[PDB]
Amino acid sequence: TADVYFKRKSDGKLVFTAEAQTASFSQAISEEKLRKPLYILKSEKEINLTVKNAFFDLEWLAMTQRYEVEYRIYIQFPNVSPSGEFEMSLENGLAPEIKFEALADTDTDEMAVVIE
Amino acid sequence: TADVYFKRKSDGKLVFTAEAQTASFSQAILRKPLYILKSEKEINLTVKNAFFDLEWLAMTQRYEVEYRTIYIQFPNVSPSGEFEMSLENGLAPEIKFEALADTDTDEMAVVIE
Amino acid sequence: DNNVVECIKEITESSRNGKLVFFVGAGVSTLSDYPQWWRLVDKYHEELYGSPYSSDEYLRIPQIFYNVKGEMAFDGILKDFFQVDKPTNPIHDKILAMNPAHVITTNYDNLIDTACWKRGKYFSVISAEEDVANATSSRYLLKVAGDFRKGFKGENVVLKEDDYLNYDQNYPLISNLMKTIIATHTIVFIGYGLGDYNINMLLNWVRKLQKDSFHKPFFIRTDPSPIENETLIYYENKGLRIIDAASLIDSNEYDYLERYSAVMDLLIESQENKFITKDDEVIDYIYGKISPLFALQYIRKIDLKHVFE
Amino acid sequence: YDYHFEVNGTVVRHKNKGFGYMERFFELKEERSKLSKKQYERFNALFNFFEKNGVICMAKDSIEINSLAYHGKYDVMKKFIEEQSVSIEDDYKKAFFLACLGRWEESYDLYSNIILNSIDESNGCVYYLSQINRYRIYQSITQAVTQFNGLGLLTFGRHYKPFTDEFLARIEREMTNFNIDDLFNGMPFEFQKKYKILEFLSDNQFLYDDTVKLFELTNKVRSEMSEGSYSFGMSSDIVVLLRLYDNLRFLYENCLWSVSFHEFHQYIRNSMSLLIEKAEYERTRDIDELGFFMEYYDFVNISRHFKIDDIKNLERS
Numbered sequence: 001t002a003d004v005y006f007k008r009k010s011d012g013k014l015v016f017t018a019e020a021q022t023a024s025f026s027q028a029i030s031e032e033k034l035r036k037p038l039y040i041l042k043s044e045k046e047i048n049l050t051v052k053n054a055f056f057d058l059e060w061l062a063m064t065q066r067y068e069v070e071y072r073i074y075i076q077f078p079n080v081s082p083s084g085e086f087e088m089s090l091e092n093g094l095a096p097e098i099k100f101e102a103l104a105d106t107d108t109d110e111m112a113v114v115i116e
Numbered sequence: 117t118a119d120v121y122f123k124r125k126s127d128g129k130l131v132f133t134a135e136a137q138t139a140s141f142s143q144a145i146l147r148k149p150l151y152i153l154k155s156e157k158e159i160n161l162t163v164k165n166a167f168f169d170l171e172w173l174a175m176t177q178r179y180e181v182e183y184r185t186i187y188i189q190f191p192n193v194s195p196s197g198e199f200e201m202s203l204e205n206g207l208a209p210e211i212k213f214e215a216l217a218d219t220d221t222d223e224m225a226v227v228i229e
Numbered sequence: 230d231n232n233v234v235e236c237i238k239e240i241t242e243s244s245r246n247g248k249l250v251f252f253v254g255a256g257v258s259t260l261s262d263y264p265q266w267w268r269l270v271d272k273y274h275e276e277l278y279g280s281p282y283s284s285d286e287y288l289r290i291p292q293i294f295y296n297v298k299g300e301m302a303f304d305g306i307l308k309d310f311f312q313v314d315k316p317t318n319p320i321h322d323k324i325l326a327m328n329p330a331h332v333i334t335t336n337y338d339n340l341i342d343t344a345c346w347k348r349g350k351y352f353s354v355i356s357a358e359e360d361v362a363n364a365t366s367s368r369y370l371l372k373v374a375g376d377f378r379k380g381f382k383g384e385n386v387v388l389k390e391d392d393y394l395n396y397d398q399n400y401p402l403i404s405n406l407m408k409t410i411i412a413t414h415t416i417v418f419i420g421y422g423l424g425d426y427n428i429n430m431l432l433n434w435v436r437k438l439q440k441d442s443f444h445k446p447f448f449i450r451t452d453p454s455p456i457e458n459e460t461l462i463y464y465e466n467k468g469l470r471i472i473d474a475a476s477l478i479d480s481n482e483y484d485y486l487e488r489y490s491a492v493m494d495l496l497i498e499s500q501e502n503k504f505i506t507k508d509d510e511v512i513d514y515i516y517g518k519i520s521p522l523f524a525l526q527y528i529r530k531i532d533l534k535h536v537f538e
Numbered sequence: 539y540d541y542h543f544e545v546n547g548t549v550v551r552h553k554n555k556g557f558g559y560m561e562r563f564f565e566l567k568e569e570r571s572k573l574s575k576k577q578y579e580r581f582n583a584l585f586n587f588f589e590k591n592g593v594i595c596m597a598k599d600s601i602e603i604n605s606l607a608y609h610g611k612y613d614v615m616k617k618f619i620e621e622q623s624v625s626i627e628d629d630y631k632k633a634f635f636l637a638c639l640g641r642w643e644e645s646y647d648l649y650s651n652i653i654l655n656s657i658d659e660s661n662g663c664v665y666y667l668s669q670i671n672r673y674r675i676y677q678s679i680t681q682a683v684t685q686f687n688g689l690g691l692l693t694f695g696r697h698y699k700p701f702t703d704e705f706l707a708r709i710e711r712e713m714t715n716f717n718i719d720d721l722f723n724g725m726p727f728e729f730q731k732k733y734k735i736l737e738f739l740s741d742n743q744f745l746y747d748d749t750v751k752l753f754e755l756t757n758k759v760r761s762e763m764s765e766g767s768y769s770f771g772m773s774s775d776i777v778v779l780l781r782l783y784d785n786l787r788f789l790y791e792n793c794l795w796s797v798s799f800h801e802f803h804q805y806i807r808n809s810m811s812l813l814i815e816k817a818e819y820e821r822t823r824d825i826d827e828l829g830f831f832m833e834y835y836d837f838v839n840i841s842r843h844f845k846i847d848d849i850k851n852l853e854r855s
């Protein structure tokens with residue numbers, strides 16, 4: 001029952017807050033054939049995260065009319081892309097669940113930082 | 117999609133006939149001397165659309181199975197009597213039976229081609 | 230025969246749609262060994278003249294006793310007869326198995342109400358004027374001849390001459406409700422005599438209605454002897470469709486439960502597919518069931534079970 | 539639908555637009571003296587009802603099933619049946635026990651007599667539940683008779699006829715053209731207004747909602763297992779367990795015979811064996827760079843609602 005804080009990457013503004021529900025890090029090796037030389041240690045690290053009850057900041061909502069995630073140990077995803085996949089249900093819809101995937105800039109080459 | 121005939125062991129009367137629906141043959145392995153190849157084999161068969169013969173019914177008011185497709189013969193089939201009631205009324209009766217093996221014969225099922 | 234078959238078909242078709250109303254007479258109550266009216270009339274006659282009929286006499290003798298011996302004597306004599314309880318007969322179960330929209334009964338007993346409670350369908354019972362206004366349920370058990378629920382006095386019931394004389398004035402709401410139910414719902418008469426006061430009054434009222442503006446009520450006759458044909462025509466031209474229990478099955482006169490059971494078993498067992506034997510009627514039935522589905526591009530195969538009940 | 543009550547026991551305001559009575563009620567439960575004496579007594583009753591049913595607190599901030607039928611106290615049930623039932627309430631669970639020990643004829647007669655005596659019911663809930671249970675007992679009797687005339691000949695060899703033909707004919711006559719779906723609609727409108735939560739018991743397939751929710755939860759749990767993700771809040775497995783226990787306790791404590799049918803057996807078998815499979819996956823789960831134990835109630839559920847082949851499949855998996 002830990003909380004995820006969404007921040008706008010540029011500034012300290014809070015995009016929204018939610019509770020971390022499911023976090024999947026299915027980071028393994030990719031195809032071998034398609035990619036004597038010095039080892040590079042290729043990888044296909046992926047980090048998905050889901051938040052159960054996310055309420056968007058009122059000031060951010062008013063202003064709206066790159067993102068960072070802080071999962072509280074403390075984990076931080078400097079860059080996260082929220083996947084906006086909307087599906088409707090016959091049962092009138094009420095839990096707004098937000099799914100986002102961690103991204104990795106080429107220069108930094110790091111996706112998530114977990115620190116005590 | 118073959119047919120199954122359930123017959124009385126002694127008299128040979130056909131208790132009923134139905135349509136074979138499922139068959140599970142799962143034989144697997146505390147239990148220096150000569151190897152005896154001890155095994156614990158089980159054969160279960162679930163039957164569909166079983167209607168009891170009028171003659172045997174009126175008489176009733178050991179068994180054999182003959183499942184003919186290529187040609188299968190199960191001697192000493194014990195009919196399991198698990199009865200459950202659905203709150204939804206009922207739809208055909210499903211019969212399940214387990215192949216039995218006599219100590220002397222040691223044979224549970226026979227395959228005829 | 231074709232006439233009785235069509236009668237049964239209409240009754241069952243109305244019942245399946247919830248448009249069936251049952252007019253339960255005193256015969257259904259007598260089947261439960263309830264004290265028939267003639268017993269109480271004989272008791273009144275004995276009390277009046279010392280030592281012991283017709284439609285006029287049935288109303289007169291209680292009427293004479295009421296004003297000759299007093300209200301209290303009338304109430305006591307009627308309570309000593311009607312206070313006894315009885316078990317609901319199989320005919321009540323058969324009546325309720327049809328899921329009738331309403332039950333109208335001239336009986337002052339609670340056997341029909343007890344059967345309705347048994348079946349689990351809540352029939353708001355209306356036996357007094359105040360009952361009509363406050364009846365939460367949409368299913369009415371209309372006691373058009375009063376009831377003893379309030380008490381065992383003779384005022385609560387309609388069984389004497391003056392009570393029948395002022396029925397329209399005394400029971401305006403109840404009479405209007407009964408007439409509306411008769412006009413709207415399919416009516417079946419069971420446990421009533423063909424030459425009955427209530428049935429004759431209903432026929433007289435129906436005569437006032439515009440021609441073919443109403444549905445002719447069904448009358449289940451359980452008299453020991455087959456009905457005379459002339460009386461059959463007379464009553465079928467008066468706005469009745471007669472189903473004779475004596476004609477369908479031959480049974481000894483002394484017992485009556487067999488005739489009621491035969492009529493009700495024909496009603497319950499009968500299904501629209503029960504009568505289709507011609508292969509020209511099989512296609513007629515199938516087309517009647519499937520024709521409205523032609524408006525749909527595709528019909529789920531499993532859903533067809535709903536079409537064929 | 540003003541609020542949403544969840545299995546954990548926390549209420550969430552979902553549709554209540556006006557003043558929030560539950561939001562204030564929970565704080566009021568947590569200065570109550572200013573309430574009237576009648577209001578204080580009513581709040582005490584409400585608090586007892588809410589804490590006994592598991593509605594503890596609001597969203598922002600084990601099970602014990604009390605019944606002789608669940609625990610298989612087949613002799614205490616017989617003793618209770620023998621005792622003279624003082625009240626109709628004590629005669630309802632007595633009919634349930636009669637059904638639980640076979641004795642379906644006695645149970646049907648007792649339910650019919652309870653319905654007969656439930657005319658003066660203050661609320662009529664016992665009458666509705668007795669109608670449901672009597673329909674269920676009639677269904678059980680019919681299916682048992684069909685089995686005895688069928689499989690009951692191959693199994694047991696003989697013909698048993700546990701129920702007399704007169705009783706069967708009478709019950710068929712009473713239950714003819716009895717649509718259980720209409721039973722709740724054919725009730726006094728006061729009952730329908732007050733007892734709206736009992737409507738689901740009327741339909742002949744009342745576990746469809748529970749089965750569908752369990753299917754959704756099973757799919758979620760299996761997706762989590764396949765992906766290898768980690769659930770943080772109340773996992774779908776815990777939700778499945780909580781709903782299974784809620785259904786079991788509601789059906790057993792209220793003495794409803796539908797708890798003995800194949801539908802409920804399969805629902806419990808699937809609710810379990812999904813907790814067990816998820817627990818086994820949790821045990822054999824590799825660590826990355828970045829428990830479940832069976833109680834007495836779990837043993838009883840597995841023994842009752844699991845066929846031998848189902849237990850074999852669970853062992854294999």
Ligand SMILES: NC(=O)c1ccc[n+]([C@@H]2O[C@H](COP(=O)([O-])OP(=O)(O)OC[C@H]3O[C@@H](n4cnc5c(N)ncnc54)[C@H](O)[C@@H]3O)[C@@H](O)[C@H]2O)c1
Nearest residue numbers: 255256257259260267282283420421422423450451452485
């Ligand atoms: N005619 C009288 O006034 C009088 C006096 C004493 C006794 N009885 C007896 O009662 C019968 C007349 O009954 P009524 O006043 O109801 O007129 P009724 O016979 O016309 O009433 C008939 C309805 O009541 C039914 N009915 C008659 N006897 C029944 C019984 N044993 N069980 C169930 N239903 C019965 C018939 O169903 C009929 O459709 C007479 O045939 C006679 O046996 C009549």
